[PDB]
């Protein structure tokens, strides 16, 4: 199973889309897993290899028959680039319309689309249908569900 209403996001907070929950990271952090974030690290040392450097990305160093550092921010294993951002392999060059491609929690072998609020998912797994999903987050004390762009999130009053 992926992110649910009771999922705890390490160094991140819960957001709600039309048909799924997701974890979004605190300032200065990026996603390692669906529910885990780590500090965004600058890839400028071999000592920093495999540290978080972007969403689903970690620092990677190449020894191209060299002694110099050849380091870049690379998609973690089981992830690949799509539209300039690392995505799950099941999301390789997949489109969602008004939504975000994710791993399908009901079947890890396929992808699905987490649709922006105001759009629901069509039977072809495209976010191109107009529907309004109510907010189902459990917000903390002195907090209220707030629509921030494409996703609901709990915000302070």
Numbering used by the authors: -1 to 155
What does the article say, verbatim?
Pfs28 is a glycosylphosphatidylinositol-anchored protein expressed on the surface of zygotes and ookinetes and plays a similar role as Pfs25 in ookinete survival and traversal through the midgut.
The construct used for crystallography consisted of V1-S173, comprising only the four EGF-like domains. The crystal structure of Pfs28 was solved to a resolution of 2.3 Å. The Pfs28 structure is comprised of four EGF-like domains in a triangular arrangement, with sides of 40 Å and 50 Å and a thickness of ~ 20 Å, with the overall structure stabilized by 10 disulfide bridges. EGF domains 1–3 adopt the characteristic structure, consisting of a major two-stranded β-sheet followed by a loop and a shorter two-stranded β-sheet, while only a single two-stranded β-sheet in EGF4 was observed. EGF domains 1 and 4 each have two disulfide bridges, while EGF domains 2 and 3 contain three disulfide bridges. Due to flexibility and a lack of clear density at the C-terminus of the protein, the C-terminal portion of EGF4 (residues S157-S173) could not be modelled. However, the crystal packing of Pfs28 did not adopt a similar tile-like pattern and we also saw no evidence of interaction between Pfs25 and Pfs28 as measured by BLI.
